[PDB]
Design a protein around this ligand. Structure first.
Ligand code: UDP
Ligand code: UDP
Ligand code: PLM
Ligand code: PLM
Ligand code: ZN
Ligand code: ZN
Ligand code: ZN
Ligand code: ZN
Ligand code: ZN
Ligand code: ZN
Ligand code: ZN
Ligand code: ZN
Ligand code: ZN
Lengths: 267, 267
């Protein structure tokens, strides 16, 4: 595919799920070879793994004293639409969470794609690889297309579910929202996070209940979201990815570990 | 024969003979039933006659405001190798002319053919047909194989030459370059074309001289090229062709006229 950027500036604003603070984004067009990067207080933070600074409950990037929290959803949408050249100006310390999914980003960006004059230089998984961490495990192997499968094992009604994304099924994961269990809310809050969470941007699940009045968008909405999160984390490789991934109970922390592993293998 | 596509992306770049502009192609694999089509600025332009928009000095395709010039050489090579399913991404407004023949295309694609699971549904000439135009004439009649004969009558040393291609002799026409007579250079340039022509991609012939220091690749290189051009134009029928063709002084304009004639006869 050809490198892409946006036709014109696109902006989004709202509260950040973790900081509880208001913030805004302005996605700026860029020319071939630029890549995806953020801009905050006069500092450019490339959307690459070398700049990750936190992976608990979100993926945060930082550089020269400037940090930006929760870049996973905007990067996932960008990865899925294959937007390769843009500068994401950030007014705040975190990306707006919006409704908790990538729907708003997806719809806006989708109808503003501008093809450019350069073939995408995809990051291609050359050989099989596995990363583990106390039960959690992610596996990557060669593939002509981006295929991501996530298998979750929850200690609640969700039980054991798995979902597979394949190129062309973008619309099946871009509406899946971020979720949290009532029993982990005190922790998240205690550790300085989740200050902006609500039933309006987060799916709260109990041992056998769903607090959101609207319920689940899909019976397996949670693993679809995990797939969504992983697509965004994979974009930290620097360019659109081509490979087959299988994540069992993975999180941002393991996703990033896998990313640095693939990167290390100068792939 | 079975439908074919390429094993992996193949790319070519260089100047376009007419625009003088730089451009690049990326031939992408496609699955059974796809067909041959171009991709430019988010628009798919099928390699079919309905999309022809210009036939003077090259065959150009267009759709939804997106145009691509000089598709004859890449389509001819594709037709000859029987590549039936690919998307030709185009970065520019014209296919790179390269050395003026189909050699580079032929060599690369040839060693990257991927047979697929479907029998080719060839376009078969069912009944005799003739198209004329002030001296020029093309005749088509049934045949189990693709046989193309071109007879040229030049007002220079070339005189009257004819060449016949038959399945299996692909390598005899894929090196024949595009040619031009010095007395027509001012015209071509005057009408906005030929901006990228040079002795490096075009064979320039005089009333009795050959400007290229390397000379002709064959004493009848020009009619071999015409045969080459006609093979490419015939592919605009939508699928590999089976028929016996005889062209006397034909050009892209008449080739296309014949194509639309055969197509009209819902053949
Ligand atoms: O197979 C799985 C995958 C995730 N989770 C839970 O999903 C919630 C989300 O947090 P996680 O540890 O996955 O980190 P994140 O993706 O937010 O970085 C946590 O409470 C996990 O224990 C689970 O129970 N089973
Ligand atoms: O039997 C022939 C066939 C072609 N030509 C010349 O070949 C050159 C190529 O131009 P053409 O009209 O064939 O255009 P094209 O095939 O590029 O559409 C022109 O100068 C023609 O007059 C010729 O002299 N005798
Ligand atoms: C489980 C993984 C992570 C992402 C963090 C989700 C945000 C946690 C915030 C808890 C939301 C609680 C909903 C009620 C808030 C309110 O009524 O103000
Ligand atoms: C008839 C169809 C074709 C288009 C061919 C492109 C024309 C450009 C030719 C190259 C120009 C070379 C200039 C030098 C002239 C000379 O040495 O006589
Ligand atoms: Zn491409
Ligand atoms: Zn924590
Ligand atoms: Zn979490
Ligand atoms: Zn997250
Ligand atoms: Zn998320
Ligand atoms: Zn003309
Ligand atoms: Zn011509
Ligand atoms: Zn031509
Ligand atoms: Zn030609």
């Amino acid at each position: 595919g050809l490198e892409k950027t946006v036709k014109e500036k696109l902006s989004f604003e709202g509260v950040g799920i973790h900081t509880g603070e208001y913030s805004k984004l302005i996605i700026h067009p860029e020319k071939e070879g630029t890549g995806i990067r953020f801009f905050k207080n006069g500092v450019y933070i490339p959307a690459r793994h070398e700049f990750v600074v936190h992976t608990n409950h979100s993926t945060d990037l930082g550089f020269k004293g400037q940090r930006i929290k929760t870049v996973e959803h905007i990067l996932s949408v960008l990865h899925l639409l294959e937007i390769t050249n843009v500068t994401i100006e950030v007014i705040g310390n975190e990306i707006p969470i919006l409704d908790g999914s990538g729907w708003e980003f997806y719809e806006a960006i989708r109808k503003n794609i501008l093809n450019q004059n350069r073939e995408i230089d995809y990051f291609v998984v050359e050989e099989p690889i596995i990363v583990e961490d106390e039960g959690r495990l992610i596996k990557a192997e060669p593939s002509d297309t981006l295929e991501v499968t996530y298998e979750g094992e929850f200690k609640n009604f969700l039980g054991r579910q798995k979902f597979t994304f394949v190129e062309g099924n973008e619309e099946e994961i871009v509406l899946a929202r971020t979720f949290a269990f009532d029993w982990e809310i005190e922790h998240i809050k205690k550790v300085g996070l989740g200050k902006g969470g609500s039933l309006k941007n987060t799916l709260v699940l109990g041992k056998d209940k769903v607090y959101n009045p609207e319920g689940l968008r899909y019976e397996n909405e949670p693993v679809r979201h995990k797939v969504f999160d992983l697509i965004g984390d994979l974009y930290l490789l620097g360019s659109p990815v081509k490979g087959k991934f299988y994540s069992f109970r993975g999180g941002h922390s393991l996703n990033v570990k896998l990313v640095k592993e693939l990167a290390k293998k100068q792939k």
